[PDB]
């Protein structure tokens, strides 16, 4: 195809007969200002990838779509807005000296986040606003930068999440945003060992990203050596980072009538990433083999969560409540009696710790966040939900305005 | 002379806050009502829950003004909105 | 004893345990001599009597002399607190695309530090400054940064009355003595930027003066009756607003309750009077009293406060075209008799409350429409409560 | 020489967050149940609705972190500080 973006690091060339992109890393190394050459098209890439998956399983939306060889990927095209987007948890690098007194290591909660024009200074939101950029239809107001400030941040927590699996500190990072055909805003640039700042054990001292590259006064090809070795550590240590980690959500009916709203329940956890299965059982009409059911799922080492679905006068949530220690979550399903059945729900006897929810939708979700406490996975799509949710509504205020 | 100056323009705006456009047929019903009456009146839609500190965002927008304000907290459910405001 | 500035001198007061401020007849924006310590000093004087009426606590105490007034004596914090409602000044230097008078909604404010360098929250909390055992954390620089958008809003809303926009602001704090953090130093003209009719052109602040590369005593004529024409305008920014609340209440017995809501009202400014009146055993009578607090031309609210089944509050707003609310008095009936005061017949505007407290806030908030200081008390409160919850949590924690 | 494993100390917090200190004696009441558990607890006062900025400040402190946490909202009343939450 034809090329339209050129990069230090990278070429993005159209793909004319399949209406996207192919974005091509190119062997260089452009640490900031210095410029040098080595074998590491293959490694970002392939580092890029991955991130861009572990992102897509989140719900995020991005451009990336799969790779196409070894040192390039395929993306839907659009148009890019020309703002560095940064991330940090920690004071280190350039901060410090925007703003002296601060002392490295100094923790960001919630993250700090700055943003950078090209061609790079700091720009402020208002700046961004002001400038009146208009890509591919959508003119980026507050509400597009606000989208972007929440998925910046997002998106390094995801990551931060990620990389504690493998004992490394995601100490900062820097993304960037495209507005596609539809108008619709995706993260679109690449994300490698040149888009973060990686402290495995929190040690700045064992720091594995281009930091390494920028700290050289002098440049040899040993050098190089370390930085090429430094990167395809980080390569390899992202295969563990998306595990497959072991959890069921198990739902109780009282009786196959309350069938609509489990499955209400299930649609809604499975979306979110849970294994859910759907048990009829009575707490009164067949006590022992209620008992019998729950024993064979505690049975597992790995996560197991109880939502009990009975409708009128609830015994089944306190009963397993009773005899089990995995958590219990009572969902009674809809009724006009429910004003008056739920206190068989909420009031259990003393030292049970059965816990009462009203929708079958927030059930779902109390069982997701209580599993995302081990599968980041499912506490990212929580996450994502949020801003889905935040961004929608700003949709409707727009219409109704 | 006093007679241009016997009905004069008083400003003043009230903002309905809904939770969820869902609630989008009773907040036209309050507006259809207020502004029979002669109010200025904004329908708009934000969460205390889902969209806390837009929310606080949205009214200090309105908070900049030297004409009187009057908000309207319009939420089903538990009401966080109203409280929240 | 002594503590020296450009415009200001700041004395011990040793018979008085507790400081003057001498101001001085020089303007240093970049420095020359005037007649102006007595315009200055008495401009500060009415702000900050202001500021008192709101409940902003302050180092200020009373005017000692023409150009001299007494504080509180207290340890300064080396930042400058700056709010901005618009985009203009330096701002636009450091902000380069965004035009001036672009709008700041919740009002913009940055902090500089006594050396002028910018600094961040951050910055002030890695500092680690301390006065009077009052070491600054990120809850004093919240509530810094509050109370500075919250002096910003008050005054913002003063100059209102005199048709002038006020633009931007700078404040100090101190720490006093026992370790409350105080707005301190001065308020005056060159505290801020203000803008007649919001027109930039006929600004009345100290920037006439920054502008200047030279510098005629013709300019710092124009400049004096700049400033003396505030201090002028500053009288009128504090005018007796009249509004009445009446609490109605359906029986004797309901005079606890009722005197809680007075004692909250009147704590907000509010002039309040106590009735009683059936309007089931004294229906005419009712719609009599009614009338009578309708002869006015100032606002009015009315409370109505109804055991049982509440037909008070309800006959007043069909009755009458002022607000009325409805705050019943405490009873373990309150759940079932509360409908009697929601659920009014269609066409009645009686709007419901549950607590006496609460009620007359409402009132408050009806009438600061129109009154900025009750306004502002409301705001100040706020204020207040938040600061509370942190101490609270700072023993629990 | 296995058996040394397992027994290690594994990172969580339950926060719990009441609306009022007024609500103390309830707060400790859950407090001492979960440290007989075992757990690790953190009594904090904040209101959704009087502090609404502070209350999000301070969950994203306890949001740093790499271990587990659970958090509980004690609010008389009206409860908006659990849904914000």
């Given at each position: 195809g034809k090329l339209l973006i050129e990069g230090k690091t990278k070429q993005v060339f159209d793909v004319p007969d399949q209406p996207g992109l192919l974005l091509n890393k190119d062997r260089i190394t452009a640490g900031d200002g210095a410029h040098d050459l080595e074998g590491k098209a293959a490694i970002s890439n392939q580092t890029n990838a991955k991130v861009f998956e572990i992102l897509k399983s989140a719900g995020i939306k991005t451009a990336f779509v799969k790779i196409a060889s070894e040192t390039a990927f395929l993306s839907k095209k659009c148009e890019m807005i020309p703002i560095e987007w940064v991330t940090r948890r920690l004071a280190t690098g350039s901060f410090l000296k925007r703003n002296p007194g601060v002392p490295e290591g100094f923790r960001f909660t919630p993250p700090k986040q700055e943003t950078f024009f090209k061609d790079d200074p700091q720009w402020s939101e208002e700046q961004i606003i002001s400038a009146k950029f208009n890509y591919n239809g959508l003119l980026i107001g507050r509400d597009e930068v606000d989208y972007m400030r929440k998925a910046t941040i997002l998106i390094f927590e995801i990551l931060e999440k990620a990389w504690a699996l493998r004992?490394?500190?995601?100490?900062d990072m820097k993304i960037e945003f495209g507005v596609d055909t539809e108008g619709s805003i995706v993260l679109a640039d690449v994300i490698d060992s040149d888009s973060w700042r990686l402290w495995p054990s929190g040690d700045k001292r064992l720091m594995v990203d281009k930091q390494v590259y920028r700290n050289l006064t002098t440049v040899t090809a040993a050098d190089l050596d370390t930085v090429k070795r430094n990167f395809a550590w980080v390569k390899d240590q992202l295969?563990?980072?998306?595990p497959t980690i072991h959890h069921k959500v198990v739902v109780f009916m009282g009786s196959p009538a309350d069938q609509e709203h489990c499955q209400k329940i299930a649609k809604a956890a499975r979306e979110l990433g849970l294994d859910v299965d759907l048990r009829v059982t009575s707490a009164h009409k067949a006590t022992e083999e209620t008992l019998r059911i729950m024993q064979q799922y505690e049975d597992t080492h790995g996560a197991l969560v109880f939502i009990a679905v009975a409708g009128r006068s609830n015994g089944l949530g306190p009963v397993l409540s009773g005899n089990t220690s995995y958590p219990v979550i009572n969902c009674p399903p809809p009724s006009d009696k429910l004003v008056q059945d739920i206190w068989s729900s909420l009031s259990?006897?003393?030292?049970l710790g059965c816990a009462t929810v009203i929708y079958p939708d927030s059930a779902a979700l109390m069982a997701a966040q209580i599993i995302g406490l081990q599968d980041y996975l499912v506490w990212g799509r929580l996450r994502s939900k949020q801003l889905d949710m935040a961004h929608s509504l700003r949709q409707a205020d727009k219409k109704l305005r």
């Amino acid at each position: 195809g034809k090329l339209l973006i050129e990069g230090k690091t990278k070429q993005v060339f159209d793909v004319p007969d399949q209406p996207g992109l192919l974005l091509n890393k190119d062997r260089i190394t452009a640490g900031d200002g210095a410029h040098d050459l080595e074998g590491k098209a293959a490694i970002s890439n392939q580092t890029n990838a991955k991130v861009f998956e572990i992102l897509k399983s989140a719900g995020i939306k991005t451009a990336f779509v799969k790779i196409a060889s070894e040192t390039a990927f395929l993306s839907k095209k659009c148009e890019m807005i020309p703002i560095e987007w940064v991330t940090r948890r920690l004071a280190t690098g350039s901060f410090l000296k925007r703003n002296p007194g601060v002392p490295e290591g100094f923790r960001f909660t919630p993250p700090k986040q700055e943003t950078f024009f090209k061609d790079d200074p700091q720009w402020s939101e208002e700046q961004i606003i002001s400038a009146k950029f208009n890509y591919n239809g959508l003119l980026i107001g507050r509400d597009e930068v606000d989208y972007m400030r929440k998925a910046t941040i997002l998106i390094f927590e995801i990551l931060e999440k990620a990389w504690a699996l493998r004992d490394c500190a995601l100490i900062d990072m820097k993304i960037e945003f495209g507005v596609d055909t539809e108008g619709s805003i995706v993260l679109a640039d690449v994300i490698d060992s040149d888009s973060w700042r990686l402290w495995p054990s929190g040690d700045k001292r064992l720091m594995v990203d281009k930091q390494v590259y920028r700290n050289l006064t002098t440049v040899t090809a040993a050098d190089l050596d370390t930085v090429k070795r430094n990167f395809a550590w980080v390569k390899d240590q992202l295969d563990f980072l998306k595990p497959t980690i072991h959890h069921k959500v198990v739902v109780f009916m009282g009786s196959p009538a309350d069938q609509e709203h489990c499955q209400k329940i299930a649609k809604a956890a499975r979306e979110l990433g849970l294994d859910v299965d759907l048990r009829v059982t009575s707490a009164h009409k067949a006590t022992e083999e209620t008992l019998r059911i729950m024993q064979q799922y505690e049975d597992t080492h790995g996560a197991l969560v109880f939502i009990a679905v009975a409708g009128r006068s609830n015994g089944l949530g306190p009963v397993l409540s009773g005899n089990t220690s995995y958590p219990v979550i009572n969902c009674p399903p809809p009724s006009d009696k429910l004003v008056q059945d739920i206190w068989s729900s909420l009031s259990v006897p003393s030292g049970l710790g059965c816990a009462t929810v009203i929708y079958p939708d927030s059930a779902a979700l109390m069982a997701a966040q209580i599993i995302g406490l081990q599968d980041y996975l499912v506490w990212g799509r929580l996450r994502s939900k949020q801003l889905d949710m935040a961004h929608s509504l700003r949709q409707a205020d727009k219409k109704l305005r």
